[PDB]
Design a protein around this ligand. Structure first.
Ligand code: V1A
Ligand code: V1A
Ligand code: CL
Ligand code: CL
Ligand code: K
Length: 162
């Protein structure tokens, strides 16, 4: 297991534009295209991301391309954020993956907003952090995925993905 395999499990793989759990146009391995309700807007975002006139459909290799860029972007977002970087630096590799996962799903700004959870993570108070993380719109809206990510923070293992 690693961050790529973890997010591949959580996000799935679909080669045609679809709507994610929030109702937003997405493709590939959880690549958010736009929050706009316009399918044409989503298709334009797709063409720009891939660099060709698509039909709203991409190849698996293209999905993996976007995925690698997106994982990189999540790590970058963490490292450039004054709230997230110290926590990331403080974590072991498995828990780092959990934090990357959250940023991939909700974005840098959203995760940086979890101030009290972040503090508990930096304090290595894992059970307490797990309880606090579940008290969230995030957990309520995607409870199975959030449970896997939270278990990863709680235990420092990949047990939730094996
Ligand atoms: S990244 C990227 N996407 C495709 C599949 C077009 N590629 O060949 C690259 C350059 C690896
Ligand atoms: S950090 C970072 N790298 C890219 C260019 C992918 N970004 O958009 C961020 C999130 C600002
Ligand atoms: Cl430490
Ligand atoms: Cl709490
Ligand atoms: K998805």
């Amino acid at each position: 297991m690693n961050i790529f395999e973890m997010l591949r499990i959580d996000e799935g793989l679909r080669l045609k534009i679809y709507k994610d759990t929030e109702g937003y146009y997405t493709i590939g391995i959880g690549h958010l295209l736009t929050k706009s309700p316009s399918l044409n807007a989503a298709k334009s975002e797709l063409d720009k991301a891939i660099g060709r006139n698509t039909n709203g459909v991409i190849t698996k290799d293209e999905a993996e391309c976007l995925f690698n860029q997106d994982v990189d972007a999540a790590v970058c977002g963490i490292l450039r954020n004054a709230k997230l970087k110290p926590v990331y630096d403080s974590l072991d590799a498995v828990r780092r993956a959990a934090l990357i996962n959250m940023v991939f799903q909700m974005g840098e700004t959203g995760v940086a907003g979890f101030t009290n959870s972040l503090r508990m993570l930096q304090q290595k108070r894992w059970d307490e952090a797990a309880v606090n993380l579940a008290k969230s719109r995030w957990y309520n809206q995607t409870p199975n995925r959030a449970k896997r990510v939270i278990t990863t923070f709680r235990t420092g293992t990949w047990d939730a993905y094996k």
